[PDB]
Design a protein around this nucleic acid. Sequence first.
DNA 1: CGTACCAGGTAACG
DNA 2: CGTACCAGGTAACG
Lengths: 76, 76
Amino acid sequence: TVQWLLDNYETAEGVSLPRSTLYNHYLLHSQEQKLEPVNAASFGKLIRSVFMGLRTRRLGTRGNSKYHYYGLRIKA
Amino acid sequence: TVQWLLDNYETAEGVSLPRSTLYNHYLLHSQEQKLEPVNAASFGKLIRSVFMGLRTRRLGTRGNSKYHYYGLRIKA
DNA sequence: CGTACCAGGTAACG
DNA sequence: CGTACCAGGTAACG
């Protein structure tokens, strides 16, 4: 899934993506390509092996904070 | 609760205690002494401010691992 | 078959 | 009122 990640996302400045929607997109890709998906923790290992320097933020109002990969955006 | 911790537990070698039963004992102490208990994360901050050098282990058979504070035992 | 490296709650920053 | 420092799953060690 390294090339699929590179084709769909890229490191960028000052923007972030919620981790769930990114993992959710990966699960569709996996299902569509008949690949058995890894879990969210394993996916975190994969994405950090592809995109260097990602930071962790938790965005949202109190009681509603959600993890984001900071420094990443949709490429296409 | 610093003195209650020191009166009931001590650092020791080669032995561990499950985190849950220790926090469960703290909750009884809190209830019995009419003190509002802090949550498990806050309790982890408290116990590490009292007992220096505690290590983390997860003991148990596959699928059943549970966190332990390694290097601690019941004093009394 | 019993760790490594990834993946929310409360106090308190700013 | 939107981070710091605490709190299970899978691969793979040994």
